[PDB]
PDB file of C-alpha atoms and ligand atoms in Angstrom:
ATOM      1  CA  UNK E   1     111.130 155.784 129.483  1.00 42.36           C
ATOM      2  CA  UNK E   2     107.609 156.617 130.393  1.00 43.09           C
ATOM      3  CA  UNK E   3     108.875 159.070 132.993  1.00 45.57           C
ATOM      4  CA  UNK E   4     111.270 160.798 130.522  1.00 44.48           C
ATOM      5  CA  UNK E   5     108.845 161.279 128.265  1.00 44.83           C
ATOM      6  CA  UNK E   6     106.705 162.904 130.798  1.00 44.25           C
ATOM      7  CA  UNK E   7     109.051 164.862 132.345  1.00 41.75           C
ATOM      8  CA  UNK E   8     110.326 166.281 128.787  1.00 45.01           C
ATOM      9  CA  UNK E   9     107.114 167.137 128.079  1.00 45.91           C
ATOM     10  CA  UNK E  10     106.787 169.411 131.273  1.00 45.55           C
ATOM     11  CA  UNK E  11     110.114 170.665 130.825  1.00 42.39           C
ATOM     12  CA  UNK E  12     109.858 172.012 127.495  1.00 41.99           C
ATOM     13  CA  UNK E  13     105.994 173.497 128.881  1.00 41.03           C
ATOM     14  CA  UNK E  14     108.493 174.817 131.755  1.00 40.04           C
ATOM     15  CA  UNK E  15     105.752 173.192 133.628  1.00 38.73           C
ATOM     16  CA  UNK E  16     105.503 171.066 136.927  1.00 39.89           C
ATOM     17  CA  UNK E  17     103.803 167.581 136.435  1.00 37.61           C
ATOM     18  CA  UNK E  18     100.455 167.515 135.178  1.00 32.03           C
ATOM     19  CA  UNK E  19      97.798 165.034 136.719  1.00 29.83           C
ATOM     20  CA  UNK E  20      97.760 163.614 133.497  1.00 32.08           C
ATOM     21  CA  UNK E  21     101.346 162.954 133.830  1.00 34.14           C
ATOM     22  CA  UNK E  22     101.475 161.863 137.100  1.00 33.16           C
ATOM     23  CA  UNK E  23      98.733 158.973 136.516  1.00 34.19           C
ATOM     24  CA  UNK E  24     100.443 158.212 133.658  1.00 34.70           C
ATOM     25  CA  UNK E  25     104.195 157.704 135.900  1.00 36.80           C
ATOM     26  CA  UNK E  26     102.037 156.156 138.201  1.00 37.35           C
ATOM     27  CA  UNK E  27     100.453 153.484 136.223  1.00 35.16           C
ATOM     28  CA  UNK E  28     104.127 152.891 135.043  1.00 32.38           C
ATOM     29  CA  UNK E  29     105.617 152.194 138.471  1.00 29.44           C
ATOM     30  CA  UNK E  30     102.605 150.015 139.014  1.00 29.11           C
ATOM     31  CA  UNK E  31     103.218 148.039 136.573  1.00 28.57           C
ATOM     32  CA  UNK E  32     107.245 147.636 137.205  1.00 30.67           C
ATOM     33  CA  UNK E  33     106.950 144.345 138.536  1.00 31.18           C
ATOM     34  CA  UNK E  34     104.583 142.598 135.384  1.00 32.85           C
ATOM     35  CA  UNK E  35     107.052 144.431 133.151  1.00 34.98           C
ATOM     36  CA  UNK E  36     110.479 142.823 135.223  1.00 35.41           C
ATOM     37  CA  UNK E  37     108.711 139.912 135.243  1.00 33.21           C
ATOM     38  CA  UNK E  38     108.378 139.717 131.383  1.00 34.92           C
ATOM     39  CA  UNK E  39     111.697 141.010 130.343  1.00 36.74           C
ATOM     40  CA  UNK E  40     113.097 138.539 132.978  1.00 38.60           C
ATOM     41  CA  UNK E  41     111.679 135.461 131.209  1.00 37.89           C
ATOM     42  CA  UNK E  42     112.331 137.091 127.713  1.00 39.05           C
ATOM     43  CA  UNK E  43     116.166 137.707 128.867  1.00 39.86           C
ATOM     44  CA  UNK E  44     116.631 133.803 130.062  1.00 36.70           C
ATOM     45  CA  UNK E  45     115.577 132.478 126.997  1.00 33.19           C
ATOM     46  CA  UNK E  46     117.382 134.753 124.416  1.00 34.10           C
ATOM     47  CA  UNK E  47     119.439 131.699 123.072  1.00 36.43           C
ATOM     48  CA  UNK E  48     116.412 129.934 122.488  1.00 31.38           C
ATOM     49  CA  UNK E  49     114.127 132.707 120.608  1.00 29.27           C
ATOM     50  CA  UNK E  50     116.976 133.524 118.744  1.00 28.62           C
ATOM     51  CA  UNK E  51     117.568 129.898 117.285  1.00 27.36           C
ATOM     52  CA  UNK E  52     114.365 129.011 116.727  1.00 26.50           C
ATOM     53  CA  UNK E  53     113.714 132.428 114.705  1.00 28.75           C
ATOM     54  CA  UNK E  54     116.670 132.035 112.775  1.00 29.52           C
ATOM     55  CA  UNK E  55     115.673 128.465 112.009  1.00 29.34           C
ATOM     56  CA  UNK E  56     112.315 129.731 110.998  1.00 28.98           C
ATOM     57  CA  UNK E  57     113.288 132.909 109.140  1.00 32.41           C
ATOM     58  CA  UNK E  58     115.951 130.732 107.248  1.00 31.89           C
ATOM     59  CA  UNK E  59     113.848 128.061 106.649  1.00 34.23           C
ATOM     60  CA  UNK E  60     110.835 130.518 105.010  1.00 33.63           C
ATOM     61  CA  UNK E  61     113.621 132.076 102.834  1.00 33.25           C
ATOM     62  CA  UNK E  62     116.676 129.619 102.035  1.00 31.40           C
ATOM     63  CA  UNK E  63     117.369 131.871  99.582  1.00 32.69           C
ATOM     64  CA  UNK E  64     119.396 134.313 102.778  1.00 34.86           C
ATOM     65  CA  UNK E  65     122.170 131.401 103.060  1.00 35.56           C
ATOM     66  CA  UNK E  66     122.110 130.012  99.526  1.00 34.15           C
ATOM     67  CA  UNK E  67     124.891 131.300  97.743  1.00 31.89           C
ATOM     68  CA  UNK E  68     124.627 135.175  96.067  1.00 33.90           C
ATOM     69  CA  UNK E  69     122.384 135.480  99.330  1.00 34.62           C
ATOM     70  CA  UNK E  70     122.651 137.940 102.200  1.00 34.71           C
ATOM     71  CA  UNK E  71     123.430 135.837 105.009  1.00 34.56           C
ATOM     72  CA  UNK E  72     125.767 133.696 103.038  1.00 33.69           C
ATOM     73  CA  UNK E  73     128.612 132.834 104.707  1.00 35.30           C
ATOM     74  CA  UNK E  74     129.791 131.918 108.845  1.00 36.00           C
ATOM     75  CA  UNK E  75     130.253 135.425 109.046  1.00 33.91           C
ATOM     76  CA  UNK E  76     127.001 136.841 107.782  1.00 36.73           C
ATOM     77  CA  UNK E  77     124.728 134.330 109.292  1.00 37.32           C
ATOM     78  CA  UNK E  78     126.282 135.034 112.390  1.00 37.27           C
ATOM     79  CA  UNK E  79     125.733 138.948 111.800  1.00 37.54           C
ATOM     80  CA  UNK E  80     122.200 137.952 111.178  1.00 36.15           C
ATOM     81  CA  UNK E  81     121.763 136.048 113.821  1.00 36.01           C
ATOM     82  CA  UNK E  82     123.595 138.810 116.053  1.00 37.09           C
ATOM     83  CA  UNK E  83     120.746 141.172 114.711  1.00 36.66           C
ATOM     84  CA  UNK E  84     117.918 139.165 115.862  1.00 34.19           C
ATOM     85  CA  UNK E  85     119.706 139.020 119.282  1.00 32.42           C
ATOM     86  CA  UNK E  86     120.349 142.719 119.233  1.00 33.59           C
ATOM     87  CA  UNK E  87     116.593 143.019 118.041  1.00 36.08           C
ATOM     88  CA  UNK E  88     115.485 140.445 121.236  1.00 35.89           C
ATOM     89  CA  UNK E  89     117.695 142.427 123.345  1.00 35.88           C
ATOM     90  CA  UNK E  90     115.626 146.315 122.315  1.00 36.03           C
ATOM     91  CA  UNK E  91     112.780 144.554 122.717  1.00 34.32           C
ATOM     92  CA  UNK E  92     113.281 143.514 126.738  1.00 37.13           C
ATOM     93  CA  UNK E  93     114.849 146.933 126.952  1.00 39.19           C
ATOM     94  CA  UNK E  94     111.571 148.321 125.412  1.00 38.41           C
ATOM     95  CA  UNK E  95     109.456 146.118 127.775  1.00 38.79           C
ATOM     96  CA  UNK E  96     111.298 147.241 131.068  1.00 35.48           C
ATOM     97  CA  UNK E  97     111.285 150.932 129.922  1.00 35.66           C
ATOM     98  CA  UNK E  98     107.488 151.454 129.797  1.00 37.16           C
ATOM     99  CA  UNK E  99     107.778 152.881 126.027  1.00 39.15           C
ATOM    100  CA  UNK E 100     110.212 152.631 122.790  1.00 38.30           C
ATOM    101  CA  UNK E 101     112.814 155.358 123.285  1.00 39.08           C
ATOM    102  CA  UNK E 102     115.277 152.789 124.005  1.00 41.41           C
ATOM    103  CA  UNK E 103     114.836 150.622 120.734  1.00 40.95           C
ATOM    104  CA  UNK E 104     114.658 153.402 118.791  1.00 41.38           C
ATOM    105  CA  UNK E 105     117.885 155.393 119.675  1.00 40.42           C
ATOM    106  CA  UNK E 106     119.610 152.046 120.115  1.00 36.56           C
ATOM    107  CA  UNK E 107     118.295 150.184 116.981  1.00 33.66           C
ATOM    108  CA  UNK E 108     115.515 151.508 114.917  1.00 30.49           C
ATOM    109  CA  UNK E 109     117.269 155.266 113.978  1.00 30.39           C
ATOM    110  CA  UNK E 110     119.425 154.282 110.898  1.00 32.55           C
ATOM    111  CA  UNK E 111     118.850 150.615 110.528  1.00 34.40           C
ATOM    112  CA  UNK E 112     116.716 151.298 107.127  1.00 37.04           C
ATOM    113  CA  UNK E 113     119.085 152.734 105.259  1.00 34.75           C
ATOM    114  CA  UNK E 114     121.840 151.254 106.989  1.00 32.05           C
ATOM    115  CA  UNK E 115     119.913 147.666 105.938  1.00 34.17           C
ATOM    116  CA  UNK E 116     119.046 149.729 102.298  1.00 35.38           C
ATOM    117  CA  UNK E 117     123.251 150.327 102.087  1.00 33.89           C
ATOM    118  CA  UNK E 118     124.275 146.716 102.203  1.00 33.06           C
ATOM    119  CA  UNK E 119     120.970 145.244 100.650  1.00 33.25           C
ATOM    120  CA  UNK E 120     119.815 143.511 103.335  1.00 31.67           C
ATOM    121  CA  UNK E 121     115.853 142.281 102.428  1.00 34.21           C
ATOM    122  CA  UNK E 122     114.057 144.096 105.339  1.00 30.92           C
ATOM    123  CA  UNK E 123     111.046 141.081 104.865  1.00 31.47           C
ATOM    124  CA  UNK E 124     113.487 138.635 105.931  1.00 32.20           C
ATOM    125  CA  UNK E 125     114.180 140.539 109.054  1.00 29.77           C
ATOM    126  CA  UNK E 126     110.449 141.077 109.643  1.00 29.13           C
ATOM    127  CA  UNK E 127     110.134 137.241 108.922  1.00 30.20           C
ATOM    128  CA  UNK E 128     112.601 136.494 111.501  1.00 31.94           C
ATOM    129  CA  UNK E 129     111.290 138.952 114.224  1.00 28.76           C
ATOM    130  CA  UNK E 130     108.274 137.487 113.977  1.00 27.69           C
ATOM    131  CA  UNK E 131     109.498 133.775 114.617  1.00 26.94           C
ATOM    132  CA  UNK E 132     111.197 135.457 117.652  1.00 27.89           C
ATOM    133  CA  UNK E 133     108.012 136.632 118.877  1.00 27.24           C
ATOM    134  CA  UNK E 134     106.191 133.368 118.528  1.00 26.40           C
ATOM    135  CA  UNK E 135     109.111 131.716 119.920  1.00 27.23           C
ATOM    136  CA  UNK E 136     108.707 134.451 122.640  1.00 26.05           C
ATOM    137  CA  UNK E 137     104.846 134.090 123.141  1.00 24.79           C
ATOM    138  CA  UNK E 138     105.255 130.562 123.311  1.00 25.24           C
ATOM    139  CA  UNK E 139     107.197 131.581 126.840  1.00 25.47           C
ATOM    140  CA  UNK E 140     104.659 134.190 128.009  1.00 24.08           C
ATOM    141  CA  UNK E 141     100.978 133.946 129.582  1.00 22.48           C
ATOM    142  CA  UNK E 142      98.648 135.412 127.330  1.00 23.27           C
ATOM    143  CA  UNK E 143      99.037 138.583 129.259  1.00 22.51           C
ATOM    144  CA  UNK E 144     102.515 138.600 129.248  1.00 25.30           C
ATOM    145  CA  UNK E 145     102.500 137.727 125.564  1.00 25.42           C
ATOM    146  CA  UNK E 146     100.784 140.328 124.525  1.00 22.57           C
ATOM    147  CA  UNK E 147     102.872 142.937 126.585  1.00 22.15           C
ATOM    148  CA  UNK E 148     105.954 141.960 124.605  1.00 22.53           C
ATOM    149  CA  UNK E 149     103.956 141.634 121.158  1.00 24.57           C
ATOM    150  CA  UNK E 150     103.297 145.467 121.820  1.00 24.97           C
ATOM    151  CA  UNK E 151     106.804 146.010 121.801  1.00 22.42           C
ATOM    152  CA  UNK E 152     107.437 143.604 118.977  1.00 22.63           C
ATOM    153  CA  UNK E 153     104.886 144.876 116.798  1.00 20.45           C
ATOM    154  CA  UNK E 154     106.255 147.811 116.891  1.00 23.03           C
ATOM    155  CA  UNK E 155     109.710 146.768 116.259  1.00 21.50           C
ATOM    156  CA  UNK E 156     108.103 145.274 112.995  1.00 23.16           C
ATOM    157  CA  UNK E 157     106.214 148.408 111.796  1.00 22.35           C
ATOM    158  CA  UNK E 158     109.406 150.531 112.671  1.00 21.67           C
ATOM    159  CA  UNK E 159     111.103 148.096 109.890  1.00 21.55           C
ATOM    160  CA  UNK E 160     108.605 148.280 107.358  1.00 24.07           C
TER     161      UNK E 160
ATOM    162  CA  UNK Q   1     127.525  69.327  75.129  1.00 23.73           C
ATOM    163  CA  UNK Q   2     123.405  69.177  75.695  1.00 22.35           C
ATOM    164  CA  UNK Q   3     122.344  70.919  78.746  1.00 20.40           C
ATOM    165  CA  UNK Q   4     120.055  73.819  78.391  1.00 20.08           C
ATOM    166  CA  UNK Q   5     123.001  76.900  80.412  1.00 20.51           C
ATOM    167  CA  UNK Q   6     121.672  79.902  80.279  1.00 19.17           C
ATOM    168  CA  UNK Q   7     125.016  82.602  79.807  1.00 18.90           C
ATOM    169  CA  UNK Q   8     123.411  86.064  79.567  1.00 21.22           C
ATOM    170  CA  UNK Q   9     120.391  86.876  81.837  1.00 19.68           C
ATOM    171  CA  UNK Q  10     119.021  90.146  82.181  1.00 18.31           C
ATOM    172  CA  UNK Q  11     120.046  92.540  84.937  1.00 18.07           C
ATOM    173  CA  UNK Q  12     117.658  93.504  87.285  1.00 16.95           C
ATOM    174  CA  UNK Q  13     118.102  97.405  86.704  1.00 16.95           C
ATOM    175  CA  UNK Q  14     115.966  99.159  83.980  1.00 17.54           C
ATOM    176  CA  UNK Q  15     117.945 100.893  81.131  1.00 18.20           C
ATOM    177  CA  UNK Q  16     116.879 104.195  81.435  1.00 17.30           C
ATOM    178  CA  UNK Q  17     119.132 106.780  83.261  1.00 16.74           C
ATOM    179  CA  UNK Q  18     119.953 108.321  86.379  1.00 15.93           C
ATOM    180  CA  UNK Q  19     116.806 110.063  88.238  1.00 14.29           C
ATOM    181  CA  UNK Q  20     117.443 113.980  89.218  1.00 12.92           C
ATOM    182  CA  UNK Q  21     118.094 114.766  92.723  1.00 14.09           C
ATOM    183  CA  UNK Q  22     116.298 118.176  93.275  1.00 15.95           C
ATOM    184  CA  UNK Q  23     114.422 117.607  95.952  1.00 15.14           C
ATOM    185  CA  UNK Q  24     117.398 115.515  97.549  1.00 16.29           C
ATOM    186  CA  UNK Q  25     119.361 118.262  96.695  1.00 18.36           C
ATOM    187  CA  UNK Q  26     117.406 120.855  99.023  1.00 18.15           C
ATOM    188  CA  UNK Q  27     116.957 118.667 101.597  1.00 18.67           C
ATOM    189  CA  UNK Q  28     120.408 118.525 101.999  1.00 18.15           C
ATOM    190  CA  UNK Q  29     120.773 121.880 101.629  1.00 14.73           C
ATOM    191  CA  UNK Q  30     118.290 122.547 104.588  1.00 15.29           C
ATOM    192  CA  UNK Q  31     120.563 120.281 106.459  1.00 14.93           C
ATOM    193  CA  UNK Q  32     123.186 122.245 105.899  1.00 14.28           C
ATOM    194  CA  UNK Q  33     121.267 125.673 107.050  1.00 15.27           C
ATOM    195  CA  UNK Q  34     120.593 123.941 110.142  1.00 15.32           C
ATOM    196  CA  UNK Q  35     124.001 123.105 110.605  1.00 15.55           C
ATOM    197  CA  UNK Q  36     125.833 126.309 109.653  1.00 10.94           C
ATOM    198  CA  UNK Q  37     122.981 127.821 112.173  1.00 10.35           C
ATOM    199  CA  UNK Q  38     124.434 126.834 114.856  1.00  9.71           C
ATOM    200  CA  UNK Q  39     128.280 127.495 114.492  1.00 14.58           C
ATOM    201  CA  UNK Q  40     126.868 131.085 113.184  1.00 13.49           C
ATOM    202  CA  UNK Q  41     125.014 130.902 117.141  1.00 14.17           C
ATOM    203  CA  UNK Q  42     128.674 130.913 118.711  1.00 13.70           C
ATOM    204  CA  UNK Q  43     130.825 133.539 116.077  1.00 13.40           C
ATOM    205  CA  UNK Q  44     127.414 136.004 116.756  1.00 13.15           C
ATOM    206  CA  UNK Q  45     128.146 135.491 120.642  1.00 13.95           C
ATOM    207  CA  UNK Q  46     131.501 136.235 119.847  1.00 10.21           C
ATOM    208  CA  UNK Q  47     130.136 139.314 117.899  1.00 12.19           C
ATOM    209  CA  UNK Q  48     128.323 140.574 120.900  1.00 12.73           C
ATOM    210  CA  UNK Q  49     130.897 141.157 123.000  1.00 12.65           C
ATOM    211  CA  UNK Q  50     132.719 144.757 124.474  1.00 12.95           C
ATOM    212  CA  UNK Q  51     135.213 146.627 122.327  1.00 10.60           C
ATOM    213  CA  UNK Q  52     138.231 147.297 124.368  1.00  7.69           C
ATOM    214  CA  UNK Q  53     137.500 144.817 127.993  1.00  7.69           C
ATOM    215  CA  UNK Q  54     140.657 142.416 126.862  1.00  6.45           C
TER     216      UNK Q  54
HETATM  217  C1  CYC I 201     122.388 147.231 118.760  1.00  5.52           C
HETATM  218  C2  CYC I 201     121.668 147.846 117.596  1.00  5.52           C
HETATM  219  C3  CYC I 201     122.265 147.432 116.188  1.00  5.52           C
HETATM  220  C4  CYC I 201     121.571 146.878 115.125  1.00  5.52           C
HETATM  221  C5  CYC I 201     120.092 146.538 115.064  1.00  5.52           C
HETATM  222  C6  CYC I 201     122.472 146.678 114.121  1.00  5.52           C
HETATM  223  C7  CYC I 201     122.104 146.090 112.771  1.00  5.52           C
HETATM  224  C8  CYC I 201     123.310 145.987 111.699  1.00  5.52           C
HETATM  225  N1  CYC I 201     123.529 144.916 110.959  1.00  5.52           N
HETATM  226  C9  CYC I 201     124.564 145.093 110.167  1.00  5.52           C
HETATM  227  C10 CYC I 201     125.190 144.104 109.132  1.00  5.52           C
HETATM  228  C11 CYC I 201     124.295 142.823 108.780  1.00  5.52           C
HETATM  229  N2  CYC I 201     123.092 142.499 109.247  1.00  5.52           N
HETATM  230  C12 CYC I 201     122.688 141.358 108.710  1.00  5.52           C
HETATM  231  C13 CYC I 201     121.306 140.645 109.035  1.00  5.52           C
HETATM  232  C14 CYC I 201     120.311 140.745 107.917  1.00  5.52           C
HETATM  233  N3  CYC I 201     120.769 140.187 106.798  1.00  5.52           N
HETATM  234  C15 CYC I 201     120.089 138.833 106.672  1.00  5.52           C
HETATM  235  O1  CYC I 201     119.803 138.633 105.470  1.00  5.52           O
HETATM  236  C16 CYC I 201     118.732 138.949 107.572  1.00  5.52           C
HETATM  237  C17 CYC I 201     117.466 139.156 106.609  1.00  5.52           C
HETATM  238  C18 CYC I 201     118.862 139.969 108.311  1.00  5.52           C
HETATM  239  C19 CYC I 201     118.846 139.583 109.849  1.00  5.52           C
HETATM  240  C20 CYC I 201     117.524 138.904 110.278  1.00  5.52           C
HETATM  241  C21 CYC I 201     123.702 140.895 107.846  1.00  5.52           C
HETATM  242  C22 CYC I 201     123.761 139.605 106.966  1.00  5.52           C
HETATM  243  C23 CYC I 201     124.717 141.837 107.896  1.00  5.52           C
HETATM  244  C24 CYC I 201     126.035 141.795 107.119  1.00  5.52           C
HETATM  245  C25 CYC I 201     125.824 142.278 105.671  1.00  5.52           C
HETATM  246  C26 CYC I 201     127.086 142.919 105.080  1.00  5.52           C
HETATM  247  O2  CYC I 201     128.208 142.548 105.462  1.00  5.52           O
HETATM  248  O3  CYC I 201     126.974 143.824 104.208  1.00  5.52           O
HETATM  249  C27 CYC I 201     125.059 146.359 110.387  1.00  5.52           C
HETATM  250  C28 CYC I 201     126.276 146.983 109.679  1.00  5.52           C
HETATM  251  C29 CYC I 201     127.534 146.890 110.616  1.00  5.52           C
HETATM  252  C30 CYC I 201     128.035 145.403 110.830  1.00  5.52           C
HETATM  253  O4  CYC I 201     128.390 144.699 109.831  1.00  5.52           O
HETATM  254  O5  CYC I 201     128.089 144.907 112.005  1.00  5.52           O
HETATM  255  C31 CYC I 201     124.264 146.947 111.361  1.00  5.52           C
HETATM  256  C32 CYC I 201     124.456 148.381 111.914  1.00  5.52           C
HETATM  257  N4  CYC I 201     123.635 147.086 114.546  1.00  5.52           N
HETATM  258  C33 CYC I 201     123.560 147.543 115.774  1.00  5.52           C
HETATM  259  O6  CYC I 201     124.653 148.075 116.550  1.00  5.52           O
END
């Protein structure tokens, strides 16, 4: 969160709450309700993001499903898909949380060589978060788009 | 026997062989993404769920 990371900050300065830091909770809890708001619409539409990005990501790279691919199989498309999910998921968790603390110690510590171990091709996954986040911006306001492009962005340079 | 009967007419179909079916051949494999897509929607629901909440 926005206020953890403030308040570790002052902790390890053994250190009250700067001004600094207090604007910077402030201007978090001020913009709580944009941020629900956001993460609300992102988290009623998470069956539809995810199909359309996994129809986009497959259909960029049909190589995934074909045969001697990654995703081949029920079981590994649906592991795929479950990543995009768990991926949409960090991303409202990243949104509501003012920062990315929660997407990294959830999803982003580990996945590259945990993707590197079973030779999963981290441009498909990039291919298919960024379907999700058109899918998603397609949703959103322009405001509210670019919120949650922050937060996928990130997600995106995290892989790469 | 003097009427002109004509026995052996020409088929329609040209003689040369069977066309490939490449592009066919993706299409329908597109298809099948599409279709695998969806059943691979319910097993990752499935996937999602808590470990030990039986
Ligand atoms: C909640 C946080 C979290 C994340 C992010 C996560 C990702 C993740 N995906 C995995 C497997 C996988 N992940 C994928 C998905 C990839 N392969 C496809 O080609 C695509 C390019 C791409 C998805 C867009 C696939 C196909 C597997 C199975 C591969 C295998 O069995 O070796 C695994 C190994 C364990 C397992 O099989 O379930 C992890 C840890 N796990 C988590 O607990």
């Amino acid at each position: 969160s926005a206020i953890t990371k403030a308040i570790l900050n002052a902790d390890a300065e053994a250190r009250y709450l700067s001004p600094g830091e207090i604007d910077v909770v402030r201007g978090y809890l001020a913009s709580g309700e944009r941020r629900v708001r956001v993460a609300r619409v992102l988290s009623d539409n998470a069956l539809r993001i995810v199909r359309g990005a996994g129809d986009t990501m497959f259909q960029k790279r049909p190589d995934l499903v074909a045969p001697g691919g990654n995703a081949y199989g029920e079981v590994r498309t649906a592991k795929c898909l479950r990543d995009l999910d768990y991926f949409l998921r960090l991303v409202t968790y990243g949104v509501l949380a003012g920062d990315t603390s929660p997407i990294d110690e959830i999803g982003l510590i580990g996945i590259k060589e945990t993707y590197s171990l079973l030779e999963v091709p981290v441009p498909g996954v990039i291919d298919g978060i960024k379907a999700a986040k058109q899918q998603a911006a397609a949703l959103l306001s322009s405001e509210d788009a670019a919120e949650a492009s922050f937060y996928f962005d990130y997600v995106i340079s995290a892989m790469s | 026997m003097q009427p002109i009967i004509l026995r052996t007419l020409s088929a329609r179909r040209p003689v040369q062989g069977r066309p490939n079916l490449e592009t066919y051949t993706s299409e329908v494999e597109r298809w099948k993404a599409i279709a695998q897509t969806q059943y691979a929607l319910e097993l990752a629901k499935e996937m999602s769920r808590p470990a030990l909440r039986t």
